[PDB]
Structure 1
């Protein structure tokens, strides 16, 4: 790497450890969990991860926090297997934690059907020799539902607003730190492309909603830090123009899809091409058959909802 030999300014922070005075990245940058120091004896976690990373995240958590009885909150953006998979495994080690999530997210953990999908996907990600810890029941998690527009006063230095951001999933929320101009955006802007510096759209429920969410997030004060559900912490113009860029990349995808369909292409064609182009990034946390499946689903949603070309 070049970066061995020069102290340049990094636009993306992608290593575990301290990101800012109040903020650490725990576990794996691929599916990170963030730690906020709220106080001398108080902490919050943000993003709920994949189950197989339990011990990775737990060891990093213990590097910074001598007493895990001091972790008081755990904010969750949405119900997908990769954003809540640690909860049953680490909540039992966090006796004072309250999970904060949307009503629709909380409802999913009460659904036998939903919880078993979450379990099925997370089991496929266990590494060689890994055994998960003892789990809590999903319906026994210490949860509180949070609402659109709600101010979460996590502590005297940390007040974060819950902003509804449906479209990626029907339950997706994001969390905005007004003081720090720092947005925890989950998968609402898509998947950040590490080779190209652009957003790949992740529209798995509703395109109109996904665009409207981005429209709304573009109106926040200019971001200084943008923290998606995968890949680390973005700063500079990548943060400041994140929501706008995410929006345009989604339009672009619609244009490609509707153009190729014009030429009589099947949806499966663009899907295999998107799986080929984009699937490599998430191979270590999303089974490849399921990335292609998700690509096809997104293209179905766009095909139905995109404004026609004539």
Structure 2
């Protein structure tokens, strides 16, 4: 494995564990002797796995006080209706737009449909809270979340991947939970693959701002584990570069008269393997096409 990427379940740092699968992780923060937080909301089918793992570390689940959520995509909030009823004291901390999504019928539909496609035959989901009944507190750009005596995290708006996306920055630890704002980390090659699914200008602007943070030591995206060393320090910059690279490739191909499909198909070939276990059906190819449409409009 690579020393700069921690990619195994369990303890990551003195205060930090990875619950569930490294591909769609839930992070556990130990806030004090009787207090914990979760970060990232996973996929619904992982409810019993994540619960099992949580209970190995947390003897009394009424001590889980906060659950921080980066964005509204199905793979970042799918666990909430299934595990919140088991976490009686939890407060879900999410952006205003992310909270709005959970009050939208159309929105909830897509999330439930995409999550149901990842169930296996033999599983029953736990009994769920209604999405509009989740124990939420909306949080604002720039807000400091005083989670515990040695855990103070700043909310930072990071739109572009989605129109609601935020990141959470722990400056004590130079630790950034960046969701999908940097893209998908390529485990084979050590580079970012852009995930521009809403707005390219916003995505790049977000990265520009994140580059201005004090140097990072730990960078924790939505998928793939914890990145450290140079990967953390250079991540926002590298992510920006890889986005420009993709834009340039797209223009090269379109200038030869190719349809957006030729590159979508190539990108689905080159990149779709890593996420096959949590992107159902045709979603990766369609996501590629979406992203290329966005880039094409905002830069052809």
Q: Name the TM-score, length of structure 1 as normaliser.
A: 0.96
CA offsets 1:18-73 (integer angstroms, 9 cap, x no match): 00000000011010000000010000000000000001100110000000000000
For the residue of structure 2 that corresponds to 1:280, the secondary structure is coil
Q: How big is the shift at 1:130?
A: 1.2
CA offsets 1:93-135 (integer angstroms, 9 cap, x no match): 0000000000000000000100010000000001231111100
Q: How big is the shift at 1:9?
A: 7.2
Q: Give the distance between the partners of 1:9 and 1:224, measured in 2 at CA.
A: 16
The 8 Å contact of residues 279 and 288 in structure 1, kept in 2 or not, is answered as no
Q: How big is the shift at 1:281?
A: 0.7
| Structure 2: runs of 5 or more not aligned | none
Q: Which residue of 1 aligns with 2:275?
A: 282
For the residue of structure 1 that corresponds to 2:138, the secondary structure is strand
For the residue of structure 2 that corresponds to 1:223, the secondary structure is coil
For the residue of structure 2 that corresponds to 1:256, the secondary structure is helix
| Structure 1: runs of 5 or more not aligned | 1-7
Q: Which residue of 1 aligns with 2:47?
A: 54
Q: How big is the shift at 1:287?
A: 1.5
Q: Name the TM-score, length of structure 2 as normaliser.
A: 0.99
The 8 Å contact of residues 26 and 32 in structure 1, kept in 2 or not, is answered as yes
The 8 Å contact of residues 43 and 70 in structure 1, kept in 2 or not, is answered as yes
RMSD: 0.8
The 8 Å contact of residues 183 and 227 in structure 1, kept in 2 or not, is answered as yes
Q: Which residue of 2 aligns with 1:105?
A: 98
> Runs (4+) of structure 1 moved beyond 2 Å?
none
The 8 Å contact of residues 149 and 163 in structure 1, kept in 2 or not, is answered as yes
For the residue of structure 2 that corresponds to 1:282, the secondary structure is coil
For the residue of structure 1 that corresponds to 2:247, the secondary structure is helix
Q: Give the distance between the partners of 1:105 and 1:296, measured in 2 at CA.
A: 24
Alignment of 1:56-135 (within 5 A): 56-135=49-128
